[PDB]
Design a protein that fits this description.
homodimer, eight-stranded parallel barrel, two-stranded antiparallel ribbon, about 20% strand, binds chloride ion, binds magnesium ion, zinc (chains A, B)
Chain lengths: ~280, ~280
C-alpha cells in the first residue's frame, strides 16, 4: 500500500468547449478547475495555456499568470509546464522554462500521431533538457514508444537528464502505441532494469484508455495521470463534468487497490522536488 | 537446420567513396558489387540509387536500370527497392513502385535519426502500402521502434498490409533504438505473438552493431541483413573490401549456428514471392 501520485492534465492543446464545456480554457476556468482537482486528490497539474481565441499557445506570460494563480490558490501543488509541440515550434516550446516551475514535460523521441508526425528533433530535445538543468526543473518524460525510454536512460548516462528520469508511458494514441497490456508490463520491466526497482514512473491513456491505464498503473505500483487534456468522457455515452470527476475515478482505483493517494507533500518527497 | 536468408543493402543514401571506396555508386558498380554479394550468399538486394554526382535520389529510371541489371546478372535474386525518406519526399518515395519489384522497404512509423526526425506521416505510409498492394509488391517493414511492429499488425488486421508482415528490427541507430539484447528478444516475442511462431523476420544493426545483430538474428531463427548501406567496416581496424566480405561474415555465423544459407528459391518460398 505505497502512496500513489495523481497528476491532472487540465486543458491540453486540442480539447474545446464544444467537446466538453467542462474543459478549462480561460485563466479563471483553469485555476478553478485545478482547485477542484487538487481537493479531489491531484498533486501535480500538467499545464497548457490557450490564447484569447482559445487556441494553443506557448506564450510565457500566460504560463506565468497560471503558475502564479496555482501557487496562490493551490499552494503546495506541483506545477508542471508543457513543452508540447502542438502549442509551438522549436525553442518557442521552452520559452516558459525560465519561470522555474517544479517540473516540465519533455519528449525525447519522435513518433506518429493520429493525423501527423509528432516532431521532436534531437537538437531541440537536447536544448529543452539543458534548459531544464539550467533552471533546476524536474522533467517528466512523455514516452510514446519503447526507444524513448532507452533514450532517457542514455541521457541520464551522459548527464543530459539529472538523477533518475521520471517516465510516463503514453498509450492509446492512434498511429503510436496502443493500450497493450503485454507492452505495458514490458515498459515496467524496462523502467525497473534501467532505473532501479523503485524508480517512480507513471502512465497516461488517451480517450477510453485513460481509465484503463489508471488501473494498470495503480495496480502495478506506478503513479497515474488523468484529466480533460487526454479524455473528455466518463464512459462512451457521458461527458465528464470536471477534471475533479476524472481525478475521483483514479482515487476510487487507489481505494480498490489499497493504495493511499499521495499528498502534495509526499509527491514532492517521491519526485525529489523543492519543499514548497 | 532452418534456412537463413541473407539480405545485402548495397549502397544506401549516405555512404560515399570517402567512407569506403568499395561503396557502389554507379549502375555498373552496383551490379558488380551485388553480383559479388549474391555469389557470397545474399538472396535479397536492398537497393538505393544515386545521381550522376553520387547523391541520393528516387529517380525511377535509375531504379528501372538497376532492377534490370540485377535480373540479368543475378537471375533468381530477390529485388527490393527503397522507399526511404532520405532520397525523396512524399509520394516521390513511391514513384519506383510501378516497376513491380519483388519487394520494397516500408516504414510504418516515425522516429528520430542521428541528425533529424525521420518523418513517415500516416497518410504517406498508407499511400505507399496501398501502392504496394496495387503492384503486388511484398513489403519489408523497417521497424525502428516497438510501436512500428504493433502498427504493422493493425495494418494486417484491416487489410492495409497483405499476408504476414515481414518485419526488420533496425538497431544501433543514434537517437532511435540501441542494439539492446533484452529489447531484441522482446521484438521476437512480439512478432511471434502477433504474427505466429513461424512468421519470418529479420534484423539489421548499424555500424559496429551490424555483426552483432547478425549473430542475434541467426542464432535466434531470424534472417540477416548486412551491407555497406549500414556499415563500412570489418572491424575496429579495417574497412570492408566489398559488400561480399560483409555477406561472408554472415555466412560464417550461419555455419557457427549450424544453419544453411537459404537458396534464392527457398527465400522466394519463405517470403511468399513470385517464381523466376
Ligand atoms: Cl540523420
Ligand atoms: Cl500521401
Ligand atoms: Mg500535455
Ligand atoms: Mg535502405
Amino acid at each position: 500500500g505505497k502512496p500513489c501520485i495523481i497528476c491532472v492534465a487540465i486543458t491540453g492543446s486540442l480539447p474545446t468547449k464544444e467537446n466538453n464545456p467542462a474543459v478549462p480554457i480561460t485563466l479563471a476556468e483553469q485555476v478553478e478547475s485545478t482547485h477542484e482537482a487538487f481537493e479531489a486528490g491531484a498533486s501535480i497539474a500538467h499545464c497548457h495555456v490557450r490564447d484569447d481565441e482559445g487556441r494553443p499557445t506557448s506564450d510565457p506570460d500566460r504560463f506565468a499568470a497560471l503558475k502564479e494563480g496555482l501557487e496562490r490558490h493551490c499552494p503546495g501543488m506541483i506545477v508542471q509546464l508543457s513543452t508540447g509541440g502542438r502549442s509551438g515550434a522549436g525553442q518557442a516550446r521552452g520559452a516558459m522554462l525560465p519561470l522555474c516551475p517544479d517540473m516540465a514535460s519533455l519528449s525525447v523521441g519522435s513518433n506518429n500521431f493520429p493525423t501527423r508526425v509528432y516532431e521532436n528533433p534531437p537538437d531541440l530535445v537536447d536544448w529543452l533538457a539543458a534548459e531544464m538543468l539550467k533552471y533546476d526543473i524536474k522533467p517528466e518524460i512523455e514516452a510514446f514508444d519503447l526507444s524513448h525510454i532507452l533514450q532517457a536512460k542514455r541521457m541520464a548516462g551522459d548527464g543530459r537528464l539529472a538523477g533518475t528520469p521520471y517516465v510516463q508511458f503514453v498509450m492509446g494514441v492512434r498511429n503510436a502505441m496502443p493500450a497493450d497490456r503485454d507492452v505495458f508490463d514490458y515498459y515496467i520491466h524496462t523502467v525497473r532494469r534501467l532505473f532501479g526497482e523503485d524508480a517512480p514512473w507513471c502512465a497516461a491513456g488517451i480517450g477510453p484508455s485513460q481509465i484503463v491505464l489508471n488501473e494498470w498503473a495503480i495496480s502495478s505500483g506506478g503513479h497515474a495521470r488523468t484529466g480533460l487534456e487526454d479524455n473528455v468522457r466518463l464512459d462512451r455515452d457521458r461527458l465528464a463534468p470536471s477534471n475533479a470527476a476524472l481525478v475521483g475515478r483514479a482515487v476510487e482505483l487507489c481505494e480498490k487497490y489499497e493504495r493511499p493517494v499521495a499528498t502534495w507533500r509526499q509527491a514532492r518527497q517521491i519526485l525529489g522536488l523543492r519543499m514548497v
